[PDB]
Amino acid sequence: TRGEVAYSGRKIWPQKHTGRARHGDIGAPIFVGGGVVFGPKPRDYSYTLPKKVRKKGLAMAVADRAREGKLLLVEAFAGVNGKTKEFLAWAKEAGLDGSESVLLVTGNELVRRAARNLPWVVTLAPEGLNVYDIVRTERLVMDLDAWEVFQNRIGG
Amino acid sequence: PKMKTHKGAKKRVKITASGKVVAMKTGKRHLNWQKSGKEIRQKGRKFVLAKPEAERIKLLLPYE
Amino acid sequence: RVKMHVKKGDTVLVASGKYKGRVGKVKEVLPKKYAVIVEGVNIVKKAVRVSPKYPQGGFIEKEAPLHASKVRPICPACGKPTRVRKKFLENGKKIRVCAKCGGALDT
RNA sequence: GCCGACCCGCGAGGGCGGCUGGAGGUAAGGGAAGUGCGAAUGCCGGCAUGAGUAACGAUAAAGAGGGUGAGAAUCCCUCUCGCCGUAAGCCCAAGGGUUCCUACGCAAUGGUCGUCAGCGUAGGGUUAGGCGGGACCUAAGGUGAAGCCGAAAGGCGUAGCCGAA
RNA sequence: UAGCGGGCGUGGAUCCCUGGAUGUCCGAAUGGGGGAACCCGGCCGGCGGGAACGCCGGUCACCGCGCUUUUUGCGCGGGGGGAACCUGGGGAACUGAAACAUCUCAGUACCCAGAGGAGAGGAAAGAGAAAUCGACUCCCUGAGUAGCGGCGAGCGAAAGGGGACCAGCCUAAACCGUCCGGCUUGUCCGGGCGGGGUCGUGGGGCCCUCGGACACCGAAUCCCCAGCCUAGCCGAAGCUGUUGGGAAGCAGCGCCAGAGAGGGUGAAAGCCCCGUAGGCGAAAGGUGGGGGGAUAGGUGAGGGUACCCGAGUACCCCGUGGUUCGUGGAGCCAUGGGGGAAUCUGGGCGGACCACCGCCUAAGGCUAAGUACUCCGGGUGACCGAUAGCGCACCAGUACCGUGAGGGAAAGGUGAAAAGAACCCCGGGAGGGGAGUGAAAUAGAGCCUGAAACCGUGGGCUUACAAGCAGUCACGGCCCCGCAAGGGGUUGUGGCGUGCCUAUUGAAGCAUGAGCCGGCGACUCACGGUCGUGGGCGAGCUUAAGCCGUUGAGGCGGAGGCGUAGGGAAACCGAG
């Protein structure tokens, strides 16, 4: 701001017998780098969201996908090993082309890795769910680990 | 952040369990002598209202 | 330290912009500014006609500095990425299924 | 950005076209704000207004000839002319630090010009056993071992010490 | 920073990474001077044919500590630097209650000195009412309650409890020897030493009965190993056609992936390149109880005693300050002064005090953690983008300004690479004119864009009978677009026509600011309530810190707050 200027409190002008305007110390927003006023700061955008309604949304989100019928929870996979070929062939198994999205859901280190580089395979897993993620994406790939995750998440 | 909440007002007022700003009469001490029980019983209590709503914004947090 | 590009000092092929699709001579590497040149940008430079080092009419040039990431490795095969190898005596870099890199001096 | 005699909105504005320009842009659905100028004798910036006008810095003054160079009353070489001489001549202390000296140079600075410099680029120059100051002296004064005192800082301060035209 | 130039690299160079030499003089400066980089010497060696001059190397400051026969010294340390974070001796005023002296900013700036990656504190002479808790810092909440006040503005506890974190040992005095001086040689005044012991259910000293012990707690102490920091290393996968100066683009076919993070490349690239995901490494200097060892050390009953158990202290009174506490019944507690004990029958609180009753051990110390801050470093952004962002994107804490203190700036762009325009023409050059060059030469050397203000060239149109907020309306004349009708704009004739903004009951005003034009430019942030509302739950709604988790990843966590009953000053009653 206008007080934390790398200058001083020097009131150079008098007030009376001068010429042009009337000013205190150089530090004022009426000049150059002279501190601005009320603007941008390294602040904090944050607040609270009641679990109930919040988790309503959680359920509701996957529920909205459960309102279009775009999900699947495979047990064991053909692409268990974190290599691309097998996982793609298995994507052909489940019925997945090459222009979609993979908020997958599922919890398997192997799976997440191979599916991390593959372009349209943004990959999501369950210990940290997200409803933004499902709205923007589309494929609850699943193990019931993530579904059982849903259960104790929205229990009530 | 945490503000004062003023206890002068609190130490001389009492709203009616909602927001109807109500209290005590004004004008004792320097009367008496020349009168009777008339204004005596009548000094008892008071109503208070209208601008005491602004006064109701004055007090704030505690309610009480 | 930290100038480990992908070039050394011999011969390689070209895919640039000026004359994209040629090949590189001995390849004078100078400097660490990624400037590289073989016979590439053979334009024409001035230089005054003065009697000293210059003829009565000074107006000629040849090879001229150029960008480094404009070329690709090769070997007795075609021209593929150079993957390195421990010779357990020295250390060079073979080629996809095939071979040669610095293997002209007992490598 | 430029230009517009075309399209759209009651409007701020939105679209299309060509030239300039050469590597970005960012819908619809949303959102986060240094966000909208024309003034504040605004901060700044650029540039005009008077304006070919007042002035070229003490009313002691130049002339020619010749020379140089693209360019001369403006520099220079000699003939000629006036002004000072308690100073307007010479020195020292002071201060300024290459300004010096020379070859060249005018784009600046010079209150025009300038081949000229006191400016410029580069080189080259400042010699002490005797001058002058330091390997000698103190004065006012200061610092300061000691000492007195101050909450802190430090004040006060003997012997000593730096100290001068 | 180009160069001349003459030299070094697979008998392995620049180079970074490590240690060491070098480290001249100034600099707390330090022999001693002293105006900052100069000068003067006592001393040991060295050099000059070297005594007389000079340098080379060695030395030479002050305060605080123990030994040193007071001796000379020997060993020790010391000062001065520092952005903010912490502690202390003192210490303002601006302002604020719209006045002003108490109350306020404020113990904030300031001065000095100190201390450390932490500081500070810490084992209860504690809370305060639980006959209950159980060392210290931070947080949240208790609660803005309690409580203070020209009862004015305003100032603000802790206990509670839920979290971050958890660490515990000694002294003095008693007491037992031992060494040294004195001396009223005493069975003595003390002190240099060692063991003795540390208490709040009171402990122990010492003396006697138990049996008093290998083991046992094991360090904050020493010793290591794994692991971290300052050079590096492997690295998935593409080939052709094409517009062009350049393709990566659009197309064909093929591939890569623990790698689609980004940057480069003449442009927009997973597949060309540093690298990414992942995986891997150190001789040198430093880091580490995590695993471990050992070491320092620390662990047991009872009788009698009765020795001690912190002295100008505790305690009283006057002058004090903190604590929410302003003179209040003021308690505790920190101390200017005067006064002045005790040894567990010892003494500090429970808000004067008395009583009771609980609480509790002073007047001698120490202790990691958690906590804070940000110059330097990495991380990384609904952060800015050459008047912004630091005043500094560049030879900026620099040009310039004050005697100095101090004030302090303005300022980024050719290309992809200089290929930076050779040869020639006007000139004295400066600048141009042909060239070459590159896609591009209004990309040509201050070189992306290049508005307007402001200054100019030709030409198309008007204006010399004219009275003016210069504009607008009808018409016409002219020049150029339009096939048509139309239209540009030039402005002769007439109808009309009292500047912009401020301040005013009221202005074109001779009450005011403005040269023009360009830009930076002013209603905001966490929370605190209030009305509304779009939603959730609805007699129920909701978490704080903080914890597992994230590589832009969620979840959790009942401490606490409120709504449900109000009312009485209270005691208390109670839909009364």
UniProtKB/Swiss-Prot annotation, chain A:
Modification note: The N-terminus is blocked.
Keywords: Ribonucleoprotein, Ribosomal protein, RNA-binding, rRNA-binding
Keyword RNA-binding included in the entry's annotation: yes
Effect in UniProt of substituting G3S: No effect on Ptase activity of hybrid ribosomes. No change in binding of a tRNA analog to the A or P site
Gene Ontology molecular function: any one: rRNA binding
Impact after mutating G3A: Increases Ptase activity of hybrid ribosomes to a value greater than that of pure E.coli ribosomes. Increases binding of a tRNA analog to the P site
Reported effect, E4A: Further decreases Ptase activity in E.coli hybrid ribosomes. Significantly decreases binding of a tRNA analog to the A or P site
Annotated GO biological process: translation
One of the record's GO cellular component terms: ribosome
Subunit and partners: Part of the 50S ribosomal subunit.
Role of this protein: One of the primary rRNA binding proteins, this protein initially binds near the 5'-end of the 23S rRNA. It is important during the early stages of 50S assembly. It makes multiple contacts with different domains of the 23S rRNA in the assembled 50S subunit and ribosome.
Family to which this protein belongs: Belongs to the universal ribosomal protein uL4 family.
The protein's name in its UniProt record: Large ribosomal subunit protein uL4
Stretch of the intact protein here: 53 to 208 of 210
From Swiss-Prot, chain B:
Cellular component annotations (GO), alphabetically ordered: cytosolic large ribosomal subunit
One annotated GO molecular function: structural constituent of ribosome
Record-level GO BP terms: translation
Family matches, as Pfam families: Ribosomal_L35p (PF01632)
Recorded superkingdom: Bacteria
Keywords in alphabetical order: Ribonucleoprotein, Ribosomal protein
Family assignment from sequence similarity: Belongs to the bacterial ribosomal protein bL35 family.
NCBIfam families per record: rpmI_bact (TIGR00001)
Name the record gives this protein: Large ribosomal subunit protein bL35
High-level lineage: Bacteria, Thermotogati, Deinococcota, Deinococci, Thermales
Gene behind the chain: rpmI
Swiss-Prot record, chain C:
Keywords: Ribonucleoprotein, Ribosomal protein, RNA-binding, rRNA-binding
Transmembrane segments: none
GO CC aspect terms: ribonucleoprotein complex; ribosome
Pfam families: KOW, ribosomal_L24
Keyword Ribonucleoprotein among record annotations: yes
InterPro entries with a match to the protein in the record: KOW, Rib_uL2_dom2, Ribosomal_uL24, Ribosomal_uL24_CS, Ribosomal_uL24_KOW, Translation_prot_SH3-like_sf
GO molecular function list: rRNA binding; structural constituent of ribosome
SMART domains in alphabetical order: KOW (SM00739)
GO BP terms, alphabetized: translation
Gene3D superfamilies assigned: 2.30.30.30
PROSITE patterns with a match to the protein in the record: RIBOSOMAL_L24
Assembly behavior: Part of the 50S ribosomal subunit.
Family listed: Belongs to the universal ribosomal protein uL24 family.
Function of the molecule: One of two assembly initiator proteins, it binds directly to the 5'-end of the 23S rRNA, where it nucleates assembly of the 50S subunit. One of the proteins that surrounds the polypeptide exit tunnel on the outside of the subunit.
Name of protein: Large ribosomal subunit protein uL24
Species this protein is from: Thermus thermophilus (strain ATCC BAA-163 / DSM 7039 / HB27)
Gene that encodes the chain: rplX
